[PDB]
Design a protein around this motif. Structure first.
Motif, PDB file in Angstrom:
ATOM      1  N   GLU A 201      50.917 -39.663 -17.242  1.00  0.00           N
ATOM      2  CA  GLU A 201      52.159 -39.373 -17.960  1.00  0.00           C
ATOM      3  C   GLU A 201      51.915 -38.342 -19.080  1.00  0.00           C
ATOM      4  N   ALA A 202      50.701 -38.304 -19.621  1.00  0.00           N
ATOM      5  CA  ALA A 202      50.363 -37.349 -20.672  1.00  0.00           C
ATOM      6  C   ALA A 202      50.557 -35.888 -20.245  1.00  0.00           C
ATOM      7  N   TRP A 203      50.366 -35.583 -18.965  1.00  0.00           N
ATOM      8  CA  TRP A 203      50.582 -34.208 -18.524  1.00  0.00           C
ATOM      9  C   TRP A 203      51.657 -34.061 -17.442  1.00  0.00           C
ATOM     10  N   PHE A 204      52.464 -35.102 -17.237  1.00  0.00           N
ATOM     11  CA  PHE A 204      53.669 -34.989 -16.412  1.00  0.00           C
ATOM     12  C   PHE A 204      54.964 -35.262 -17.203  1.00  0.00           C
ATOM     13  N   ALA A 205      54.861 -36.040 -18.279  1.00  0.00           N
ATOM     14  CA  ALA A 205      56.032 -36.562 -18.987  1.00  0.00           C
ATOM     15  C   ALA A 205      56.982 -37.294 -18.032  1.00  0.00           C
ATOM     16  N   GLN A 206      56.395 -38.037 -17.096  1.00  0.00           N
ATOM     17  CA  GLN A 206      57.152 -38.930 -16.219  1.00  0.00           C
ATOM     18  C   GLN A 206      56.501 -40.303 -16.293  1.00  0.00           C
ATOM     19  N   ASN A 207      57.318 -41.348 -16.380  1.00  0.00           N
ATOM     20  CA  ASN A 207      56.819 -42.706 -16.554  1.00  0.00           C
ATOM     21  C   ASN A 207      57.509 -43.577 -15.521  1.00  0.00           C
ATOM     22  N   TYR A 208      56.724 -44.192 -14.643  1.00  0.00           N
ATOM     23  CA  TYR A 208      57.274 -44.903 -13.491  1.00  0.00           C
ATOM     24  C   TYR A 208      58.170 -46.071 -13.913  1.00  0.00           C
ATOM     25  N   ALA A 209      57.707 -46.873 -14.871  1.00  0.00           N
ATOM     26  CA  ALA A 209      58.504 -47.985 -15.394  1.00  0.00           C
ATOM     27  C   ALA A 209      59.852 -47.511 -15.946  1.00  0.00           C
ATOM     28  N   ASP A 210      59.842 -46.364 -16.621  1.00  0.00           N
ATOM     29  CA  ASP A 210      61.050 -45.752 -17.182  1.00  0.00           C
ATOM     30  C   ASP A 210      62.031 -45.344 -16.081  1.00  0.00           C
ATOM     31  N   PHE A 211      61.505 -44.743 -15.014  1.00  0.00           N
ATOM     32  CA  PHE A 211      62.319 -44.364 -13.856  1.00  0.00           C
ATOM     33  C   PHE A 211      62.984 -45.596 -13.249  1.00  0.00           C
ATOM     34  N   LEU A 212      62.213 -46.669 -13.086  1.00  0.00           N
ATOM     35  CA  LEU A 212      62.735 -47.892 -12.468  1.00  0.00           C
ATOM     36  C   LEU A 212      63.860 -48.498 -13.303  1.00  0.00           C
ATOM     37  N   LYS A 213      63.750 -48.356 -14.618  1.00  0.00           N
ATOM     38  CA  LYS A 213      64.752 -48.885 -15.528  1.00  0.00           C
ATOM     39  C   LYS A 213      65.988 -47.981 -15.617  1.00  0.00           C
ATOM     40  N   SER A 214      65.800 -46.693 -15.400  1.00  0.00           N
ATOM     41  CA  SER A 214      66.846 -45.714 -15.680  1.00  0.00           C
ATOM     42  C   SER A 214      67.674 -45.272 -14.464  1.00  0.00           C
ATOM     43  N   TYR A 215      67.079 -45.307 -13.269  1.00  0.00           N
ATOM     44  CA  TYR A 215      67.753 -44.806 -12.059  1.00  0.00           C
ATOM     45  C   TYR A 215      67.960 -45.891 -11.023  1.00  0.00           C
ATOM     46  N   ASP A 216      68.965 -45.711 -10.169  1.00  0.00           N
ATOM     47  CA  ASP A 216      69.133 -46.625  -9.052  1.00  0.00           C
ATOM     48  C   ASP A 216      67.958 -46.527  -8.087  1.00  0.00           C
ATOM     49  N   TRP A 217      67.469 -45.308  -7.864  1.00  0.00           N
ATOM     50  CA  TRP A 217      66.337 -45.091  -6.971  1.00  0.00           C
ATOM     51  C   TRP A 217      65.281 -44.185  -7.570  1.00  0.00           C
ATOM     52  N   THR A 218      64.032 -44.590  -7.407  1.00  0.00           N
ATOM     53  CA  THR A 218      62.914 -43.736  -7.775  1.00  0.00           C
ATOM     54  C   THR A 218      62.259 -43.231  -6.504  1.00  0.00           C
ATOM     55  N   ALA A 219      62.339 -41.917  -6.292  1.00  0.00           N
ATOM     56  CA  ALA A 219      61.880 -41.317  -5.044  1.00  0.00           C
ATOM     57  C   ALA A 219      60.471 -40.768  -5.246  1.00  0.00           C
ATOM     58  N   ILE A 220      59.496 -41.554  -4.810  1.00  0.00           N
ATOM     59  CA  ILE A 220      58.096 -41.237  -5.027  1.00  0.00           C
ATOM     60  C   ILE A 220      57.647 -40.222  -3.999  1.00  0.00           C
ATOM     61  N   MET A 221      57.025 -39.139  -4.462  1.00  0.00           N
ATOM     62  CA  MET A 221      56.527 -38.131  -3.546  1.00  0.00           C
ATOM     63  C   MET A 221      55.169 -38.570  -3.014  1.00  0.00           C
ATOM     64  N   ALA A 222      55.240 -39.399  -1.973  1.00  0.00           N
ATOM     65  CA  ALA A 222      54.072 -40.002  -1.345  1.00  0.00           C
ATOM     66  C   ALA A 222      53.449 -39.019  -0.375  1.00  0.00           C
ATOM     67  N   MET A 223      52.874 -37.958  -0.929  1.00  0.00           N
ATOM     68  CA  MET A 223      52.442 -36.820  -0.144  1.00  0.00           C
ATOM     69  C   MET A 223      50.973 -36.520  -0.404  1.00  0.00           C
ATOM     70  N   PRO A 224      50.095 -37.097   0.422  1.00  0.00           N
ATOM     71  CA  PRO A 224      48.655 -37.017   0.137  1.00  0.00           C
ATOM     72  C   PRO A 224      48.107 -35.599   0.211  1.00  0.00           C
ATOM     73  N   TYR A 225      48.590 -34.791   1.145  1.00  0.00           N
ATOM     74  CA  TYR A 225      48.046 -33.441   1.270  1.00  0.00           C
ATOM     75  C   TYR A 225      48.481 -32.571   0.092  1.00  0.00           C
ATOM     76  N   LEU A 226      49.669 -32.836  -0.436  1.00  0.00           N
ATOM     77  CA  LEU A 226      50.123 -32.182  -1.656  1.00  0.00           C
ATOM     78  C   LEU A 226      49.165 -32.505  -2.804  1.00  0.00           C
ATOM     79  N   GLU A 227      48.664 -33.736  -2.804  1.00  0.00           N
ATOM     80  CA  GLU A 227      47.777 -34.224  -3.847  1.00  0.00           C
ATOM     81  C   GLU A 227      46.307 -33.870  -3.613  1.00  0.00           C
ATOM     82  N   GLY A 228      46.026 -33.079  -2.579  1.00  0.00           N
ATOM     83  CA  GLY A 228      44.668 -32.622  -2.318  1.00  0.00           C
ATOM     84  C   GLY A 228      43.779 -33.624  -1.607  1.00  0.00           C
ATOM     85  N   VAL A 229      44.379 -34.694  -1.101  1.00  0.00           N
ATOM     86  CA  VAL A 229      43.642 -35.728  -0.378  1.00  0.00           C
ATOM     87  C   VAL A 229      43.227 -35.243   1.012  1.00  0.00           C
TER      88      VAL A 229
END
Ligand SMILES: CC(=O)N[C@@H]1[C@@H](O)[C@H](O)[C@@H](CO[C@@H]2O[C@H](CO[C@@H]3O[C@H](CO[C@@H]4O[C@H](CO)[C@@H](O)[C@H](O)[C@H]4NC(C)=O)[C@@H](O)[C@H](O)[C@H]3NC(C)=O)[C@@H](O)[C@H](O)[C@H]2NC(C)=O)O[C@H]1O
Length: 359
Positions: free
Chosen positions: A241-269
């Motif tokens: 969160e220090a270098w994204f300014a995104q917080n998963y718990a905050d998303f869950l509290k604030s939005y109806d849906w949190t759309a996680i970018m579950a993309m391993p190749y994007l992440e260099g995996v």
């Protein structure tokens, strides 16, 4: 919104054609494709992005501030909602708009340099700390809300800030007025303020999206659902969160849906590690009570080259990952992007792992 949620995330850049008759046939094929898929929801692109340059210069709806490349968002939306049987979320940039030059851009402070700059490899974001920016982006959302009917808003993943941002003057003033001490370089390296600073920025981004949502709801009503894309690292590695300014718990509290970018190749995996990476991600989610109930796992159907010549992920690979998610107890998922022009991913291979209606 009855479960499970199964989402197709769709660009209209594919549908566009200078020839109106061809564009009509394109829209018809798209509508039929989504109908045939028999899933629950489409996240539908409301902006044009032909070049993938991280900056929106034109959009797909009539509005007061930017050129309209073609009036097709509202047309595709109502047909998907009435013929294809899906809810529609309007997919909109939060910050990356090519507006008036006097509007504040997000900047970063380079190490060893005194003047803030704009990083070429980031989304070209306007600053959420500039109230004029908030007003003009607000206008774009109001214009979309006025001219199109839809069921929700998907807030783009461009609502992010690094640990060297936002270094612009209005951001600096906002930090000062919030009680932060010193230059940006001092704050980010101050053990007693750097965590508070990261959270301040995360909340600032979220508050801005909720302001945009309130403006749309004032027009289309309270029933409008909200979703926002979150990067995978803030989910699996919360210190990020220090270098994204995104917080998963905050998303869950604030939005109806949190759309996680579950993309391993994007992440260099690595290819042989991607399954394990997805299992680890879903294990993390399941360890947070009811997180899975408010989260959508969004898989990648292309392998992007920061250059620009993207590579398709095979239909078999995508179906494999969908099966993997289900076998690991995840019911809400989708993928980005869809390519109707080429039946990619192949509907016959994807449907049995994607549609609950499959027989
Ligand atoms: C010693 C060592 O190498 N270990 C470190 C470890 O300390 C640390 O966990 C990580 C990350 O450190 C932090 O990295 C921040 C981001 O760095 C920028 O990352 C850019 C690439 O970002 C990826 O982008 C994709 C989307 O395209 C996203 O999906 C993905 O999740 C992103 N990856 C990450 C890790 O965020 C890269 O291109 C930039 O050059 C890079 N910039 C800089 C300045 O490094 C960074 O901003 C933090 O300051 C840094 N701080 C820490 C960890 O103290 O690095 C391991 O190598």
């Amino acid at each position: 919104e009855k479960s499970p949620q199964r989402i197709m995330h769709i660009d209209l850049d594919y549908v566009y054609d200078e020839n109106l008759q061809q564009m009509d046939r394109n829209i018809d094929v798209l509508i039929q494709r989504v109908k045939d898929m028999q899933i629950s929801t489409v996240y539908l692109q409301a902006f044009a992005d032909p070049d993938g340059d991280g900056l929106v210069k034109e959009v797909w709806f009539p509005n007061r501030l930017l050129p309209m490349k073609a009036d097709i968002f509202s047309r595709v939306a109502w047909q998907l909602r009435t013929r294809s049987g899906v809810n529609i979320y309007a997919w909109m940039p939060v910050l990356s708009w090519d507006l008036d030059p006097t509007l504040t851009r997000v900047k970063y402070l380079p190490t060893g340099e005194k003047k803030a700059q704009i990083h070429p490899e980031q989304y070209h974001r306007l600053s959420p700390f500039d109230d004029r920016v908030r007003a003009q982006v607000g206008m774009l959302y109001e214009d979309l809300a006025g001219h199109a009917a839809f069921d929700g808003i998907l807030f783009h993943d461009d609502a992010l800030l690094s640990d060297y941002e936002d270094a612009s003057a209005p951001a600096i003033t906002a930090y000062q007025q919030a009680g932060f001490s010193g230059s940006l370089s001092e704050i980010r390296q101050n053990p007693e303020q750097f965590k508070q600073w990261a959270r301040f920025k995360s909340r600032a981004l979220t508050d801005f999206t909720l302001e945009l949502s309130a403006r749309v709801k004032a027009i289309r009503g309270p029933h409008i659902k909200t979703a926002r894309n979150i990067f995978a690292l803030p989910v699996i590695q919360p210190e990020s969160e220090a270098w994204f300014a995104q917080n998963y718990a905050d998303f869950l509290k604030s939005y109806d849906w949190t759309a996680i970018m579950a993309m391993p190749y994007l992440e260099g995996v690595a290819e042989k590690s991607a399954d394990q990476w997805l299992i680890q991600l879903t294990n993390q989610i399941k360890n947070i009570p009811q997180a899975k109930d408010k989260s959508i796992l969004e898989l990648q159907a292309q392998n992007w080259q920061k250059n620009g010549q993207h590579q398709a992920i095979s239909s078999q690979q995508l179906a494999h990952w969908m099966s993997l998610l289900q076998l690991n107890g995840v019911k809400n998922y989708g993928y980005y992007p869809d390519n109707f022009l080429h039946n990619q991913p192949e509907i016959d291979l994807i449907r049995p792992e994607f549609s609950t209606a499959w027989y």
